[PDB]
Write a protein that binds this ligand. Structure first.
Ligand SMILES: Nc1ncnc2c1ncn2[C@@H]1O[C@H](COP(=O)(O)OC(=O)CCCC[C@@H]2CCSS2)[C@@H](O)[C@H]1O
Ligand SMILES: [Mg+2]
Length: 337
């Protein structure tokens, strides 16, 4: 058989992306794979994105929404169980993302929805208010294979989608790919019945129809670690701060705050999630600990826990500025979250 059909029972984007990556690396040359999956509360960003610029990382952290960086290109999307994902993989030179797009459009047609491709990566439906995006796609290719993965909005919480994709206003000068915002809708507005299982079946049937074969589905469960080469290491990396946050392209952040005890402005340059240069400007009446902080920050992780550690470490040699340092510490954490 040339097909493989894989259905995930995990709702963890890190698990599901690691499965996708290991399956993809190990895929025989002649195989075509369909992988069908969902993620609970997640924002997934493209390989070259800056999370702090592209989504509300602070709100996500408060609400236990997971950040996942994927290996494909493109922008930032929100997943909950009302969102369904597909991945189609194939070897080159056969691989062509147009084929899998047409398979999804055929599945939607079979369910009674008329959609069409829009721009490079969207599927859109017509509504009384104008065209709405129900799907976003992204792609990855190597010398000898490709995959096309994308979403379908069935019954996603669109108020949460907006919330986590509306970042705090920050002075970030950031390299990387920026998201392209659209107006979206749920398929449930067109088909009130519609379920994840129904959509998975329709996509499955259209995949089988296109290729002229059927195969038995294989279920992948987080209850048994998948016996895929390098799974443990891939999963650990996919889960890590260093991958999801630290892989952001080089950027600068200009942070500033007025305190009762004076103004502080900080300029961080960040590369690979570390502060490679920090500069402090202040009119505090006791600037010494702030000057000490500026030198000590070089090499520090751009992350609240480590920044607060550096602020608070100054209490030993600057105990008279405890009030200032604790205010600075709490502010700075909130400013980089
Ligand atoms: N879940 C989802 N589905 C469709 N569109 C969405 C979704 N979430 C947000 N959006 C809208 O798309 C834009 C961003 O569009 P943009 O074109 O910038 O990015 C994409 O579409 C990326 C698709 C990635 C698909 C992968 C599938 C497996 S893991 S995630 C966002 O600002 C909203 O307007
Ligand atoms: Mg868009």
């Amino acid at each position: 058989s040339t097909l493989r059909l894989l259905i995930s029972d995990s709702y963890d984007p890190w698990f599901n992306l690691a499965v996708e990556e290991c399956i993809f690396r190990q895929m025989p040359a002649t195989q075509r794979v369909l992988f069908l999956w969902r993620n609970a509360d997640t924002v997934v960003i493209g390989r070259a994105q800056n999370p702090w610029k592209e989504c509300n990382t602070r709100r996500m952290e408060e609400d236990n929404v997971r950040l996942a960086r994927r290996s494909s290109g493109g922008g930032a999307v929100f997943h909950d169980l009302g969102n369904t994902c597909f991945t189609f993989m194939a070897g080159k030179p056969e691989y062509d993302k147009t084929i899998s797009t047409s398979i999804v459009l055929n599945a939607l047609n079979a369910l009674g929805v008329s959609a069409e491709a829009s721009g490079r990566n969207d599927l859109v439906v017509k509504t009384v208010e104008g065209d709405r995006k129900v799907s976003g796609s992204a792609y990855r290719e190597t010398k000898d294979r490709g995959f096309h993965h994308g979403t379908l909005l069935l019954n996603a919480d669109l108020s949460r989608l907006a919330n986590y994709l509306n970042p705090d206003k920050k002075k970030l000068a950031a390299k990387g790919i920026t998201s392209v915002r659209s107006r979206v809708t749920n398929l449930t507005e067109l088909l009130p019945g519609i379920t994840h299982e129904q959509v998975c079946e329709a996509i499955t049937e259209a995949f089988f129809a296109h290729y002229g074969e059927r195969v038995e589905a294989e279920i992948i469960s987080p209850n048994k670690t998948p016996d895929l080469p390098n799974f443990a290491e891939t999963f650990a990396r996919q889960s890590s701060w260093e991958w999801n946050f630290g892989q952001a392209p080089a950027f600068s952040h200009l942070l500033d705050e007025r305190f009762t005890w004076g103004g502080v402005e900080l300029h961080f340059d960040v590369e690979k999630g570390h502060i490679t240069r920090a500069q402090v400007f202040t009119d505090s009446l006791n600037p010494a600990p702030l000057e000490a902080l500026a030198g000590r920050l070089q090499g520090c992780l751009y992350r609240a826990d480590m920044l607060q550690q550096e602020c608070e470490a100054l209490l030993v040699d600057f105990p008279e500025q405890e009030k200032e340092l604790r205010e600075l510490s709490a502010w700075m954490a909130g400013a980089v979250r």
